[PDB]
Tab-separated table of C-alpha atoms and ligand atoms in Angstrom:
chain	number	residue	atom	x	y	z
A	1	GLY	CA	-22.767	-8.055	11.954
A	2	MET	CA	-18.901	-8.106	11.763
A	3	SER	CA	-18.386	-10.420	14.495
A	4	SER	CA	-14.688	-10.871	14.427
A	5	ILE	CA	-12.018	-8.386	13.818
A	6	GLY	CA	-9.471	-10.675	12.542
A	7	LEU	CA	-11.585	-13.471	10.760
A	8	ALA	CA	-12.738	-10.231	8.775
A	9	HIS	CA	-9.283	-9.381	7.406
A	10	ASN	CA	-8.406	-13.026	6.748
A	11	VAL	CA	-5.427	-12.273	9.599
A	12	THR	CA	-2.510	-15.225	9.323
A	13	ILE	CA	0.186	-15.309	12.282
A	14	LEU	CA	2.997	-16.899	11.786
A	15	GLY	CA	6.683	-17.253	13.608
A	16	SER	CA	7.989	-15.764	17.124
A	17	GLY	CA	10.313	-13.151	18.519
A	18	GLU	CA	9.974	-10.079	20.780
A	19	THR	CA	9.367	-7.980	17.499
A	20	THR	CA	5.869	-8.168	15.382
A	21	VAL	CA	6.665	-7.507	11.610
A	22	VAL	CA	2.879	-6.517	9.731
A	23	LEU	CA	2.532	-6.583	6.198
A	24	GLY	CA	-0.012	-4.663	3.876
A	25	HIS	CA	-0.461	-5.467	0.886
A	26	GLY	CA	-2.019	-2.396	-1.173
A	27	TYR	CA	-4.543	-1.738	-3.614
A	28	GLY	CA	-5.252	-4.841	-6.360
A	29	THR	CA	-3.988	-7.325	-4.449
A	30	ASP	CA	-4.571	-9.438	-1.190
A	31	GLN	CA	-2.388	-10.758	2.170
A	32	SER	CA	-0.551	-13.493	-0.189
A	33	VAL	CA	1.449	-11.222	-2.331
A	34	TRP	CA	4.046	-11.660	0.416
A	35	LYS	CA	4.385	-15.121	-0.134
A	36	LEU	CA	7.791	-15.061	-1.334
A	37	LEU	CA	8.929	-12.337	1.752
A	38	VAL	CA	7.497	-14.753	4.962
A	39	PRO	CA	9.830	-17.308	4.659
A	40	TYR	CA	12.695	-14.898	5.687
A	41	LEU	CA	11.135	-13.718	8.363
A	42	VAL	CA	9.928	-16.223	10.600
A	43	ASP	CA	12.860	-17.954	12.525
A	44	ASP	CA	12.931	-13.948	14.103
A	45	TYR	CA	9.983	-12.310	13.635
A	46	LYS	CA	6.315	-12.439	14.586
A	47	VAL	CA	4.519	-12.110	11.619
A	48	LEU	CA	0.975	-10.884	11.158
A	49	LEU	CA	-0.529	-10.684	7.707
A	50	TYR	CA	-4.360	-9.373	6.799
A	51	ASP	CA	-6.272	-8.014	4.554
A	52	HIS	CA	-7.534	-4.544	4.070
A	53	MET	CA	-11.510	-4.034	3.717
A	54	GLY	CA	-13.036	-4.652	-0.133
A	55	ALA	CA	-10.356	-6.686	-1.062
A	56	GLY	CA	-11.640	-9.421	-2.779
A	57	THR	CA	-11.340	-12.179	0.126
A	58	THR	CA	-13.196	-10.161	2.848
A	59	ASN	CA	-17.239	-10.338	2.527
A	60	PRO	CA	-19.004	-7.400	1.106
A	61	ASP	CA	-21.295	-6.889	3.485
A	62	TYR	CA	-18.413	-5.094	5.712
A	63	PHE	CA	-17.046	-2.494	3.702
A	64	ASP	CA	-18.883	0.476	4.332
A	65	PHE	CA	-18.241	3.224	0.990
A	66	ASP	CA	-18.274	6.200	3.518
A	67	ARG	CA	-15.778	4.914	6.025
A	68	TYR	CA	-13.428	3.715	2.690
A	69	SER	CA	-14.171	6.615	0.939
A	70	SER	CA	-11.000	8.571	2.452
A	71	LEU	CA	-7.921	6.828	3.752
A	72	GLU	CA	-8.672	7.272	7.096
A	73	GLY	CA	-11.125	4.414	6.811
A	74	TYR	CA	-8.557	2.049	6.440
A	75	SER	CA	-5.720	4.041	9.414
A	76	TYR	CA	-8.607	3.322	12.411
A	77	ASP	CA	-9.546	-0.142	10.727
A	78	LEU	CA	-5.719	-1.045	10.665
A	79	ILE	CA	-4.869	0.457	14.770
A	80	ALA	CA	-8.244	-1.842	15.345
A	81	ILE	CA	-6.537	-4.948	13.869
A	82	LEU	CA	-3.190	-4.571	15.892
A	83	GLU	CA	-5.065	-3.394	19.516
A	84	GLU	CA	-7.330	-6.736	18.797
A	85	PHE	CA	-3.834	-8.841	18.188
A	86	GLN	CA	-1.736	-6.898	21.118
A	87	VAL	CA	0.223	-5.369	18.655
A	88	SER	CA	2.984	-2.739	19.029
A	89	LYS	CA	5.945	-1.135	18.288
A	90	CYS	CA	5.432	-3.550	14.937
A	91	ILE	CA	7.850	-3.144	11.974
A	92	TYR	CA	5.032	-2.149	9.198
A	93	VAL	CA	5.355	-2.648	5.701
A	94	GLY	CA	3.016	-2.083	3.529
A	95	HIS	CA	2.537	-1.421	-0.345
A	96	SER	CA	1.791	2.055	-1.390
A	97	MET	CA	-1.648	2.260	-0.835
A	98	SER	CA	-1.241	0.648	3.236
A	99	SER	CA	2.598	2.313	3.460
A	100	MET	CA	0.643	5.536	3.325
A	101	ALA	CA	-2.424	4.623	5.375
A	102	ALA	CA	-0.227	3.205	8.106
A	103	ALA	CA	1.812	6.470	7.470
A	104	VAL	CA	-1.856	8.267	8.399
A	105	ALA	CA	-2.044	5.721	11.679
A	106	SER	CA	0.604	6.196	13.081
A	107	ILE	CA	0.305	10.003	13.876
A	108	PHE	CA	-2.998	8.790	15.769
A	109	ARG	CA	-0.959	6.174	17.492
A	110	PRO	CA	3.330	6.178	17.853
A	111	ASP	CA	2.858	3.745	20.028
A	112	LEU	CA	1.923	1.204	17.815
A	113	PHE	CA	4.728	1.312	15.081
A	114	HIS	CA	8.458	1.208	15.683
A	115	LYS	CA	8.925	1.761	12.072
A	116	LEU	CA	7.518	1.937	8.397
A	117	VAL	CA	9.047	0.172	5.533
A	118	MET	CA	6.985	1.842	2.382
A	119	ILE	CA	7.051	-0.022	-1.161
A	120	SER	CA	6.393	3.001	-3.636
A	121	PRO	CA	4.387	5.299	-1.945
A	122	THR	CA	2.900	8.187	-3.439
A	123	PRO	CA	1.429	11.430	-0.660
A	124	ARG	CA	-0.467	12.162	-4.084
A	125	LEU	CA	-0.872	11.908	-7.614
A	126	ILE	CA	-2.204	14.693	-8.996
A	127	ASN	CA	-0.210	17.780	-10.018
A	128	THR	CA	-0.182	21.677	-8.592
A	129	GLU	CA	1.911	24.403	-9.728
A	130	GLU	CA	4.416	23.212	-6.994
A	131	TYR	CA	4.503	19.520	-6.711
A	132	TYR	CA	4.899	17.131	-9.398
A	133	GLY	CA	2.858	13.344	-8.951
A	134	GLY	CA	2.547	12.887	-12.757
A	135	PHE	CA	-0.962	13.634	-13.158
A	136	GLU	CA	-3.157	16.212	-14.675
A	137	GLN	CA	-6.111	16.649	-12.310
A	138	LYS	CA	-8.322	16.885	-15.494
A	139	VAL	CA	-7.686	13.904	-17.025
A	140	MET	CA	-7.557	11.936	-13.923
A	141	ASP	CA	-11.450	13.490	-14.049
A	142	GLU	CA	-12.159	12.176	-16.562
A	143	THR	CA	-10.667	8.341	-16.674
A	144	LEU	CA	-12.594	8.052	-13.661
A	145	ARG	CA	-15.500	9.589	-14.565
A	146	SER	CA	-16.194	6.325	-16.936
A	147	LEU	CA	-14.266	4.285	-14.680
A	148	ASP	CA	-17.183	1.906	-13.995
A	149	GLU	CA	-18.075	1.103	-17.548
A	150	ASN	CA	-14.788	0.746	-18.437
A	151	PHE	CA	-13.320	-0.954	-15.110
A	152	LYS	CA	-11.759	-3.862	-16.515
A	153	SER	CA	-10.526	-2.774	-20.095
A	154	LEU	CA	-8.734	0.171	-18.585
A	155	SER	CA	-7.172	-1.992	-15.885
A	156	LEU	CA	-6.097	-4.843	-18.662
A	157	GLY	CA	-5.070	-1.813	-20.828
A	158	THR	CA	-2.840	0.301	-18.626
A	159	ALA	CA	-1.532	-3.308	-15.863
A	160	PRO	CA	1.386	-4.026	-18.280
A	161	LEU	CA	2.862	-0.617	-17.735
A	162	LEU	CA	1.662	-0.459	-14.688
A	163	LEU	CA	4.170	-3.888	-13.264
A	164	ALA	CA	5.877	-3.633	-16.287
A	165	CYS	CA	5.721	-7.040	-17.413
A	166	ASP	CA	4.417	-8.632	-19.770
A	167	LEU	CA	0.437	-9.314	-20.643
A	168	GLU	CA	1.129	-13.215	-20.172
A	169	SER	CA	3.214	-13.279	-17.887
A	170	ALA	CA	3.058	-14.925	-14.878
A	171	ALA	CA	3.036	-11.636	-12.646
A	172	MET	CA	0.181	-9.994	-15.085
A	173	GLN	CA	-2.222	-12.948	-14.344
A	174	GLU	CA	-1.751	-13.058	-10.602
A	175	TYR	CA	-1.670	-8.878	-10.696
A	176	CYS	CA	-5.042	-8.815	-12.215
A	177	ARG	CA	-6.597	-11.976	-10.701
A	178	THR	CA	-6.511	-10.738	-7.202
A	179	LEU	CA	-7.836	-6.880	-8.852
A	180	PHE	CA	-10.480	-8.774	-10.746
A	181	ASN	CA	-11.572	-10.478	-7.503
A	182	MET	CA	-13.378	-7.215	-6.248
A	183	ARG	CA	-16.510	-6.904	-6.405
A	184	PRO	CA	-16.933	-3.932	-9.466
A	185	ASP	CA	-18.133	-1.115	-7.346
A	186	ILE	CA	-15.705	-1.950	-4.332
A	187	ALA	CA	-12.855	-1.815	-6.588
A	188	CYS	CA	-14.450	1.463	-8.025
A	189	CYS	CA	-15.153	2.832	-4.743
A	190	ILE	CA	-11.315	2.300	-3.588
A	191	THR	CA	-9.689	3.251	-6.563
A	192	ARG	CA	-11.835	7.230	-6.875
A	193	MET	CA	-10.951	7.060	-2.983
A	194	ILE	CA	-6.786	6.640	-3.781
A	195	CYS	CA	-6.678	8.351	-6.973
A	196	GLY	CA	-8.135	11.447	-4.977
A	197	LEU	CA	-5.438	11.353	-1.516
A	198	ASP	CA	-3.888	14.173	-1.122
A	199	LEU	CA	-1.590	13.475	2.308
A	200	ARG	CA	1.090	16.352	1.801
A	201	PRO	CA	-0.321	18.323	5.088
A	202	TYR	CA	0.306	14.601	7.676
A	203	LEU	CA	3.676	14.183	6.950
A	204	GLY	CA	4.998	16.730	8.888
A	205	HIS	CA	2.780	14.843	11.696
A	206	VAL	CA	4.622	11.427	11.086
A	207	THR	CA	7.207	11.286	13.129
A	208	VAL	CA	7.908	7.249	13.156
A	209	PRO	CA	11.478	6.318	10.772
A	210	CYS	CA	9.814	5.696	7.541
A	211	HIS	CA	11.915	3.435	4.832
A	212	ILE	CA	11.046	4.274	1.602
A	213	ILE	CA	11.340	1.879	-1.338
A	214	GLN	CA	11.265	3.080	-5.209
A	215	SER	CA	11.171	1.092	-8.395
A	216	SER	CA	13.856	3.404	-10.763
A	217	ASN	CA	10.747	3.207	-13.013
A	218	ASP	CA	7.261	3.360	-11.626
A	219	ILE	CA	4.573	5.053	-13.907
A	220	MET	CA	2.863	5.696	-10.615
A	221	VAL	CA	6.004	7.470	-8.719
A	222	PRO	CA	8.329	10.320	-9.681
A	223	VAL	CA	12.041	9.306	-8.432
A	224	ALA	CA	11.486	13.071	-6.876
A	225	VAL	CA	8.453	12.175	-4.682
A	226	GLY	CA	10.336	9.383	-2.868
A	227	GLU	CA	13.109	12.860	-2.470
A	228	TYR	CA	9.931	15.153	-1.463
A	229	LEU	CA	8.870	12.416	1.613
A	230	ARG	CA	12.312	12.641	2.365
A	231	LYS	CA	12.455	16.021	3.049
A	232	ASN	CA	8.688	16.370	4.479
A	233	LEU	CA	8.560	13.710	6.565
A	234	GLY	CA	8.409	14.759	10.536
A	235	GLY	CA	11.012	11.671	11.746
A	236	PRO	CA	14.007	10.128	10.000
A	237	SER	CA	13.837	9.069	6.859
A	238	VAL	CA	16.624	6.848	4.102
A	239	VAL	CA	15.184	6.664	0.090
A	240	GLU	CA	16.303	3.978	-1.815
A	241	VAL	CA	15.525	3.726	-5.293
A	242	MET	CA	16.784	0.050	-6.874
A	243	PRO	CA	17.384	-1.126	-10.081
A	244	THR	CA	13.784	-2.336	-10.892
A	245	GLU	CA	10.866	-1.222	-12.254
A	246	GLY	CA	7.753	-1.349	-12.399
A	247	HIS	CA	4.797	0.049	-9.626
A	248	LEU	CA	4.809	-3.714	-7.609
A	249	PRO	CA	8.570	-5.193	-7.221
A	250	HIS	CA	7.951	-6.864	-5.222
A	251	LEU	CA	5.931	-8.938	-7.281
A	252	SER	CA	7.563	-8.613	-10.557
A	253	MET	CA	11.322	-8.051	-9.597
A	254	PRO	CA	11.359	-10.712	-6.159
A	255	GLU	CA	14.666	-11.315	-6.843
A	256	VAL	CA	16.000	-7.548	-6.348
A	257	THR	CA	13.492	-6.497	-3.976
A	258	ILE	CA	12.953	-9.608	-1.423
A	259	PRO	CA	16.301	-8.777	-0.155
A	260	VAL	CA	15.924	-5.256	-0.316
A	261	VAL	CA	12.870	-4.674	2.115
A	262	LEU	CA	14.309	-7.783	4.281
A	263	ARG	CA	17.573	-4.983	4.943
A	264	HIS	CA	15.074	-2.337	5.483
A	265	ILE	CA	13.449	-4.568	8.325
A	266	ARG	CA	15.927	-5.912	10.220
A	267	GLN	CA	18.687	-2.148	9.920
A	268	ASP	CA	17.415	0.605	11.545
A	269	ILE	CA	18.300	4.583	10.550
A	270	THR	CA	20.859	5.002	13.171
B	301	HFJ	C1	-1.249	9.988	-16.840
B	301	HFJ	C2	-1.784	9.185	-16.704
B	301	HFJ	O1	-3.177	9.445	-16.692
B	301	HFJ	C3	-4.001	8.542	-15.863
B	301	HFJ	C4	-5.401	8.689	-14.798
B	301	HFJ	C5	-6.082	6.782	-14.204
B	301	HFJ	C6	-5.593	6.086	-14.571
B	301	HFJ	C7	-6.493	4.991	-13.620
B	301	HFJ	N1	-5.303	3.988	-13.265
B	301	HFJ	C8	-4.672	5.140	-12.344
B	301	HFJ	C9	-4.276	4.683	-10.709
B	301	HFJ	N2	-5.102	3.883	-10.139
B	301	HFJ	C10	-4.561	3.057	-9.483
B	301	HFJ	C11	-4.298	4.199	-8.342
B	301	HFJ	C12	-3.164	3.591	-7.482
B	301	HFJ	C13	-2.442	4.349	-6.279
B	301	HFJ	C14	-1.443	4.061	-6.289
B	301	HFJ	C15	-1.494	5.337	-4.719
B	301	HFJ	C16	-1.889	6.108	-4.299
B	301	HFJ	O2	-0.760	7.051	-3.466
B	301	HFJ	C17	-1.721	8.395	-3.335
B	301	HFJ	C18	-2.446	6.079	-5.438
B	301	HFJ	C19	-3.754	5.609	-6.238
B	301	HFJ	C20	-5.831	2.017	-11.407
B	301	HFJ	C21	-6.687	3.485	-12.119
B	301	HFJ	C22	-7.237	2.314	-13.263
B	301	HFJ	C23	-6.378	1.244	-13.595
B	301	HFJ	O3	-5.232	2.100	-14.835
B	301	HFJ	C24	-4.689	6.078	-15.452
B	301	HFJ	C25	-3.944	6.719	-15.647
B	302	MG	MG1	5.814	19.951	4.014
C-alpha cells in the first residue's frame, strides 16, 4: 500500500520563489530528462519534479492497470501531487503526454495552474475524415496487436526517427535507457493508452493559458496539430515552431529548446 505520494512519485523540490514551476517528463523518460533546464529556474522559482506512475523509477506494485489505461488517471494523480505539496497557480511544463495530462487536470482544478507550457503536444494521433493526427486507425490497430512480442524491436527501430538522432547518439542511448527501464507489461499498457487518446472534446474546457512549443519536424505531431490546438483551446494560447527536429527537442537539441522553454515560462501571454 502506498504510504507517501511524494516518495511514490520520486518528488524533488529545488529553488525558491513566489511561483512554482512543475516539470512533467512525458512517455518513456523520467524527471532526469529536465536536468539541463533546472539550473536556469532555481534562482527565480521553486521547482517541483515528479515521475508519473509506471516510469521505471517507480514501484510497479503501485501501477493500477485500470486507472492508467486512460489519461485522466494521470491527471488525477497530478492533482494529488500538487495538493500534497501545497502547490497552486503553478507554471506546468510538460513533454507531450504529460502536458496533455496537465491540460485535463486543469479543467478539474484550474486554480492549481497559472499556465501550461507544452512541448510537442497532440490531442489525438488517429486520423478521421476531418482531423489529421498523422496515423491511420487500422495500421495502429495491427501495430499495437503485436506490441508485446515486438516492444523492443519496434521501439529501437523507430526511436532514431522519433528523436531525429542517430542510433549511436547520446540522446538515443539516454532515451532507450529510461524507456526499457519500464516493466514490459507496464510499458505496453501506457503505450496502448496514449496511442488511443482523443482529447479533442476536452480542449474547449481548458481555460488556463497554453504555450505550445513544437519541432518543425516531428513524426508524432504534424505542424497542423499546433494550429488545431490554438483554435480549439478555450483560453489564451501561443504556438512556437522551433528550428528543431524530433519529438523530444529538449533532449536532442537543448541549445535551441532550453532558451525557448525559458521564454515561455518567464513571459505570460499578453
Ligand atoms: C504511420 C506509423 O504508424 C505507427 C503506429 C504505431 C507506432 C508505435 N509507436 C507509436 C508511438 N508510441 C509512442 C506514443 C507517443 C505519443 C505521444 C503523445 C500522444 O498524445 C495523444 C500519443 C502518443 C510508441 C509506439 C512504439 C514505438 O514506435 C509507430 C508508428
Ligand atoms: Mg473544438
